[PDB]
Structure formats: C-alpha cells, structure tokens
Symmetry: C4
Subunit: 161 residues, 4 copies
C-alpha cells in the first residue's frame, strides 16, 4: 500500500504556511490558487493539520512553476521527462513543490496534465507521503479529470498524522 519518507518526516506544528511563488502562462493565477487550495484541502480534511496561505517571503511550503535550473539540486529538463517534484517536510527546501513550466498544464478544460491531480500528488509528498503500490491511489508513482483520495491515501496520511 502507501509509504512515507525514510524516517517519517512530518510537519510538527499545528499550522503550516504555504505560498504560490510563481505561476504558469497556461492558466489564470486565480485558477492555480483555487486548485492548490483544493489539493491541500483534500489531504487537510483527513488530518489534524491546518494550512495558512501567505503571499510574500518564505513559507513552509513554497509552490511554483519553473523552467530548467531553479535553485535546488534537481533542475527541470524541458518538455517531457520529469514533470514536477516535491520535498518531504523539513526546513529549507523541505515541503516545497515545483512544477516544470515546459509541459502543458490544464484545469480540465483544455489539453494538458491535470493540474489538480498533479498538485494533489506533489503536495502529498510535501506532507510526507511516499509512493503507493495501489493503482487507485493518487500517490501511485505514475500519472485525473475526476478523482478523490483513495482509501489507501487516507489510511496513509492518517497514519502519519
């Protein structure tokens, strides 16, 4: 089933702040804001953890779109191959979720990777979820138009928190 990160890293505070640092030309900013809130909320409603949005400076969870090298040890690689990545809870880069600007992202109304599903998978990592062996789980290692957390996802996040 589900998995966590080596050593079960998790957010230790009752509240975790997040910030959408950069956006994509593929969608309106407000759309990304709403979808990010929804992705967070689907994990959030299952656990004793609260998220607070900030719009400047540093937050526990820094979310953004970027092309190529962007300040961490995992530069993006253009169209295709890697699509996004996120880091387990912790200080610094810990918890951050990055999306490769060189793909095509959609709110479901156009062609593209479904951003809501992608954000839910990545933010799952940002909360401490590893990959699942259950094909129905959002945390399954491979990639949406209509979904919800699977029982395995809920079981895993509740186990961690």
């Amino acid at each position: 089933g589900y998995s966590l990160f080596p050593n079960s890293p998790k957010w230790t505070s009752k509240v975790v702040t997040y910030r959408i640092v950069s956006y994509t030309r593929d969608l309106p900013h407000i759309t990304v804001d709403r979808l990010v809130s929804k992705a967070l909320n689907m994990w959030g409603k299952e656990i004793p953890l609260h998220f607070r949005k900030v719009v400047w400076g540093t937050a526990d969870i820094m979310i953004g779109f970027a092309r190529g090298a962007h300040g961490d040890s995992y530069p993006f690689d253009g169209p295709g191959n890697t699509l996004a990545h996120a880091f387990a809870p912790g200080t610094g880069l810990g918890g951050d979720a990055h999306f490769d600007e060189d793909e095509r992202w959609t709110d479901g109304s156009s062609l593209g990777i479904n951003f809501l599903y992608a954000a839910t998978h990545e933010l799952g990592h940002s909360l401490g979820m590893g990959h699942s062996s259950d094909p129905n789980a959002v945390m399954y290692p491979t990639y949406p138009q209509n979904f919800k957390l699977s029982q395995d996802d809920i079981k895993g996040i509740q186990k961690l928190y």
Copy 2:
C-alpha cells in the same frame, strides 16, 4: 497499400463531434479552424460519416497543440523528433489529434510544416487509418503545398466505412 488499426476500430455513430481545444502562435485561430475543417472534409466526402464541431467540453475528436507532457502517455519532446500524433477511434483519448507546439507550422505562406497536410494525415489516424506502403498516399509514414487524397487513401477509408 493502406492499413487500418489492429482490430479495425472505427466510429460507430453516424455523427462524430470534434473540438479544436488549443491553438498555435504560428497561425491565426480561424486559419487553424478552416484547415481542420478542410482536412476532415477530404476524408468526410468519401464516406457515410458526418462531423460536428463543438467549442467547449469534450468531443469525440479533441484536437490541439501542446508542448511537452500534456495528459496522455506520449509527451512531446521539443523541437524536432516527434511532430504530432493521433489515436484510433474509441472512447477517451480515442480519436484525439495532438500537434507539438515546439515545431513551426504554416498555412503554406511561410516556412514550416504544412498544417493542412499534417492535419489530414493525423485526422486520418483519428478516423482509423494506419500507414500506407504507397508513397503517393497521405497516410505514408513519412512527411504538401498542394495535395489531395490518393486512390489508396480513398480505397482504405471506404473499406473501413
């Protein structure tokens, strides 16, 4: 000569809807709309199948331009290499035709891949045509300024429909 898809998939309804979901900066939207209609019509006039254009939501044939990964298992790969792809008739991704935004497309007045020819080849796949061994056929596996369906193309599409 011509070929179909393994198991002869084809549209079973008298009418098939299509939608141009995303466009290219290389051309005016209306130009893409017209060229898509023409490509469809060249296959359409030869068979008992009708196409209806829609401009929102899902249609049987979803047509669009995209860079990199875009929601299916065949992400685009930047400039060069793969130029486009389309799927045989069926539910979901079936029938869809995608074009790589990282190439240069033309209506024939500039440098670029001839979009009308490319669309006619891809939509051929969207209708259930495989590749032909006849060099004169639009469905020949390799890539326009002035063409029409070859006798092999017509023979194949009529055989399927």
Copy 3:
C-alpha cells in the same frame, strides 16, 4: 581552398529572386532585411548575377527563421548544435536558407551569433559555394564583427559564375 557542390549546381538565370519569409524576435525586421541585402551584395558584386527581393509567395531563395521541424528533412534541434543551413541552387528547397530561432542572433550590438557573417556563409551555400579549407574564408566550415569576403571566397564564386 574553396569548393562547390557535387555537380556544380548554380543559378542559371540572370536574375534570382529572394524573400525573407520569417524573422527573429532578437532583431528588428528592417535590420534583418538590411543585413540580408548586404550579405547578398557582397557575393553579388563579384559576379554576373542579380538579386531581386520579393515579399510574398515563393522566391528562388526563401530565407527565414524557424524552431524545430519546419517543412524540410532537416528539423532544427533547439539551443546549440545546428545553427542554420542552406541548400544549393535548384528548384524547390534549392537555394533556401534557414536559421534556428533557438539560438541568439545579433547585429553586432549585443550578445549573439553575428547575423551578417552567418547570413553571408549560408547565402554562400545558396549560391553554390561549398566549404573552404582556408581559415580566412567566410566559407570555412566553422564559425565576424568586422569582415569581408576573402580572396578564396571571391576566387570560388567567380569560378562558379
């Protein structure tokens, strides 16, 4: 020294038309127009051949910038690697000169590949010049801020025309 193309292809008419089909965001259109004229003129003043500019349809020498695949059998390849190519005199693609939009081009006032030098090298091919073994020649196989045709370049073009 200099070389021509296998079989000495050359323009057989007294006048050769040319058209700048597509431009680059790196420079003003008029700048590209002027630099192209200058590149042509440096070869032109040495031979009994005249060039006439056209701004629509097809011309003997079609000049343009493009990203990735663009209608011929040599798609561009993104930043780096191939920078441009041109074809020996002849019908169709013959004589055409293409420049990869994924590099940086300059009129000499910024960072970039010197477009005047690049255009002079490519249009050399468009006129029937092959590569030279003389390092001073514009037609040397490898890549400008201040130059003129070398004696080898002049000797070669005059030999062909």
Copy 4:
C-alpha cells in the same frame, strides 16, 4: 584553497569597464543592474581595481543572458545542465560573463537560481579567480540567499591583485 587561471591572467589597467548587454525576462532590468553592481563591489572592495559601467558598445567585461549559441565556442544547452560561464581577463571574449536564459533566475523573492550568488561566482572568474576546494567559498565549483565572500575568496583575489 582558491585557484587562479593557468598563467595568472588579470586585468592590468587601474580601471575595467563593464556593460550589461542583455537581460532576462525573469527580472526587472534595474534589478539585474543593481545585483551586478553589488557582485562586482564585493570583489572590488578587496582590491586595487575600479569598475566603470558603460551602456553601449564594447566594454572589458560584457555581461548578458542568452539562449543556445551566442557568439562564442560554448553555446548554451537549454533548461538544466550548464547555467552560466565566464572568461578569464584578456582581450576579446576575455572577462565576459554569460547566463543561460533557459533556467530560472531570482532576486531571492521567487523560485530560481540566486542571481546575486551566481553573478558573484561568474564575475569572480571574470576577474581571474579559478575554483576553490573550500566548500565555504563562493568560488567552490558547485552551487545563496544570504552570503558574503569567504576568507578563501578574499585571500585569493588579494593574492592576484
């Protein structure tokens, strides 16, 4: 510790001019101007060398952003891999510092490679500094939100000047 370039190239004049030739869409021009001044000044305050900014033509130190091939023998390579490069003091390309437009650069307020740190490392090369074996040094070979020259950096630059 620190290293210089083979043969200790260095600026021999009391004053060295610099010009920011091209900018990045990632940041305001003035921001790049300020950060470049700061990077120069951190090396400058430690040595008997003065920098003068120019805004046209050629300067000893030409600074700029570029995609792909850009006029030297080291074309950039798209997102990832090489991020930037600079040349040791000397005529022509000597002293120049180039940054790959295909990455993401930041002033520290967004996602991206920290431009101030990157500029300080590259301009270090432009002044004649090689790579250091000291992990605390800005000149360490690998890649920022809050830094200053390390004692090794200062020792090295003072040794050269």
